[PDB]
Every structure is written in C-alpha cells, then in structure tokens.
Design an enzyme around this catalytic site. Structure first.
Site, short mmCIF file in Angstrom:
data_model
loop_
_atom_site.label_atom_id
_atom_site.label_comp_id
_atom_site.label_asym_id
_atom_site.label_seq_id
_atom_site.Cartn_x
_atom_site.Cartn_y
_atom_site.Cartn_z
N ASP A 25 -48.02 -29.51 1.27
CA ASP A 25 -49.02 -30.82 1.28
C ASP A 25 -50.38 -30.37 1.09
OD1 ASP A 25 -50.58 -32.98 2.34
OD2 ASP A 25 -49.37 -32.86 4.30
N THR A 26 -51.02 -30.83 -0.23
CA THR A 26 -52.22 -30.24 -0.53
C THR A 26 -53.33 -31.19 0.05
OG1 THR A 26 -52.08 -31.88 -2.38
CG2 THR A 26 -51.47 -29.60 -2.86
N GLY A 27 -52.82 -32.31 0.71
CA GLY A 27 -53.78 -33.07 1.60
C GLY A 27 -54.08 -32.79 3.08
#
EC number: 3.4.23.16
Lengths: 99, 4, 99
Positions: A25-27
C-alpha cells in the site's frame, strides 16, 4: 517483481514465524497489522486512516520478510480491516511506483 | 501517520 | 516516471477542469476525491478502512488526467483529507509496483 494493479496487491509476509497476507500500500505511511501477539515491548500510538483515528501497539525493529525481501522496521498492530505494508517497509525492499 |  | 516512496507519492491530477494533488494509492480500490461539486448523476456509497467508514457520492465515467496520462472511471467524492488515486485509475495509466 513487477506487480500490476488489476487485483489488490496482496503479498505473503513472514512475521514472528507466522506467514500472513498483506496489502502493498503506497498510500500508507506505516505498516499496520491485525491484532496479533508479537514479542517486544510496544508503546501505544494513534494513527489515522480514511475513517478516522485508531490506537495501535507500536513494535520497533521487527523483522518482516515480504516476498522474500527482508525488512526490519516498525510494525503497528491494531484494528485494521486488512494487514497493510506501508511506505516505511516498502522503501527498505526498494519498491517503486512506475508508469 | 496517515494510512489510506 | 518512477516514484520512490521516501515521501508520500503525491502527483498532479486534472478533474473537471481543476488541477489537484492526489496520492497514488495501491491500497485503495477506488479513487476518492475531496468534496467537490461535480456535475452528474451520483449514487450514495459507504467506503471503509482504518478508523471506520465515510459516506461518499459515487460519480461514474469521470475523466481524469494523472500526470498527463488520461484515464476515466468512477470517482467517489466525500470528506477525505487527501485525494486518493486508487487502483481503478492506476491500472488505466499502466501503473505498476516494482521491487
């Protein structure tokens, strides 16, 4: 490897001798795992997500193996709907977004 | 410490 | 481009004629944009993740340019702190995770 985003980017991780599935998850700033017992002294910490803020247990310097790449970093444990590997560990395994 |  | 994850992957997007900063989020299934007054028919939706759920308005077939790459799809508009570009649009600009 190169991972396409047609399906959720779920990966098997190994943590505390246990295998688990987690979302790349890059967020997410942090790595936050479902409630599990981990070794170590942990501190309470509060983090926010889309729905608001929750309290988590922060464990430092935990070894986590994500698709065979080793990372050692902070792991937050608390009431997340899904195990997410956040940017604190994605940078250690050299992960980038490309397009 | 935001996690989306 | 190749975006490293030392910082939050914020990128410029254009939606409905406005330029906005948005987070490329491989964890998000769907894109959810801060409150904005878009034309179109919409449907009520609840999306959840850390902290619980927020109620959003779902608009469909909305064109978005993310770093000059055109895409078009569902956009959820609701009280999020951050515009989130989710997998429904990242797949259209050919965005991939690599390590």
């Amino acid at each position: 490897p190169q991972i396409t985003l047609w399906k959720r980017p779920l990966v098997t991780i190994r943590i505390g001798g246990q295998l688990k599935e987690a979302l790349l998850d890059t967020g997410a700033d942090d790595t936050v795992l479902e409630e599990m017992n981990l070794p170590g002294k942990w501190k309470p910490k509060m983090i926010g997500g889309i729905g608001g803020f929750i309290k988590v247990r922060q464990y430092d310097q935990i070894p986590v193996e994500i698709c065979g790449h080793k990372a050692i970093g902070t792991v937050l444990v608390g009431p997340t709907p899904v195990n997410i590997i956040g940017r604190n560990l994605l940078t250690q395994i050299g992960c980038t977004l490309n397009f | 410490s935001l996690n989306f």
